[PDB]
Design a protein around this ligand. Structure first.
Ligand SMILES: O=C(O)c1ccnc(C(=O)O)c1
Ligand code: NI
Length: 305
């Protein structure tokens, strides 16, 4: 019902699989989204002072159209750029975060800004900014059963079982979606301005889907497509429960199966994300970017093959 925030100690932090099982035992999955604040001692990496030359092969210009909190988003591929150029562009007068009193103010401006000036999103960059020295909660090495996909079938899907980086700027958005194969996801905000998340509890996913079909007749399973934006007001107006949580630098966000989510970046930032699985996911996977469930059912549910 409500988004939980967890504050693990280092000892609690060590094993990812175990801690996610713990989060679920406390009901975290019910809201569709949980925040995890790492222990004070922990770092993803020592310094981020060597990233200006990182290549953004295909920055995406995000064009919105629509009215009254209901928008379609379209992505135009732009020419390659480096992170340094991208950062400068993000902080330029044309693209910078507008002045705001607080979050509520900024959120209202975000929703009121559509269609408006299309931002550029450095999304879907194959890569990681975690160091190998980081042995807890390293998005390249979570060690969940999702590793069976590569290990048993040799299947590599970038961004699903390998990490993606997202360099964002004001107003860049992720439209409503669930993850491929109804997998979990984890998102770590390395640095920069916040990222605001909206989530609809899994219990109410089907209601969101119905509302979406009504709101986007021409387009209508089109949500996993990541193209529909629906404002909080429109959700409230149609009686869809949702939660809103802002993620700040140094914080993790975990999304759970059947948890629809959407959001936006406040300003220049850098996030890293990957999907993962648990034994609980397998039956979602059975019902569900597609891949075979064979290795999972065979190895994790030998009883039930
Ligand atoms: O763009 C993002 O930050 C984001 C957030 C949540 N999910 C996705 C996704 O592609 O699954 C992307
Ligand atoms: Ni997602």
């Amino acid at each position: 019902h409500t988004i939980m925030t967890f504050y693990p100690t280092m000892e609690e932090f060590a094993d990812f699989n175990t801690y996610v099982a713990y989060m679920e035992s406390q009901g975290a999955h019910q809201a569709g989204l949980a925040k995890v604040i790492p222990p004070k001692e922990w770092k993803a990496r020592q310094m981020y002072d060597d990233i200006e030359d990182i290549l953004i092969a295909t920055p995406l210009q995000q064009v919105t159209s629509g009215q009254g909190g209901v928008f379609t988003q379209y992505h135009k591929k732009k020419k390659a750029m480096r992170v340094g150029q991208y950062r400068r562009l993000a902080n330029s007068k044309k693209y910078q975060t507008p002045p705001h009193q607080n979050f509520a103010d900024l959120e209202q401006r975000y929703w009121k800004s559509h269609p408006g000036n299309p931002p550029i999103y450095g999304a879907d960059i194959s890569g990681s900014l975690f160091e190998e020295s980081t042995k807890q909660w390293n998005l390249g090495h979570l060690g969940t059963i999702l590793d069976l996909l590569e290990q048993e079938c040799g299947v590599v899907i970038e961004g699903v079982n390998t990490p993606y980086l997202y360099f964002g700027m004001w107003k860049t958005t992720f439209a409503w979606h669930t993850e491929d194969m109804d997998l979990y996801s984890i998102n770590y905000l390395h640095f920069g301005e916040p990222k605001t998340w909206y989530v609809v509890p899994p219990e109410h996913g089907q209601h969101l889907e119905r509302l979406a079909r009504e709101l986007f007749p021409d387009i209508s399973a089109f949500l996993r497509h990541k193209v529909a934006l629906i404002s909080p007001t429109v959700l409230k107006e149609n009686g869809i429960p949702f939660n809103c949580m802002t993620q700040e630098a140094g914080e993790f966000m975990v999304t759970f199966p059947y948890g629809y989510h959407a959001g936006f970046n406040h300003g220049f930032n850098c996030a890293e994300a990957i999907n993962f699985a648990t034994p609980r996911w397998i039956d979602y996977g059975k019902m569900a970017v597609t891949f075979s469930m064979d290795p999972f059912v065979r190895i994790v549910q030998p009883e039930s093959y």
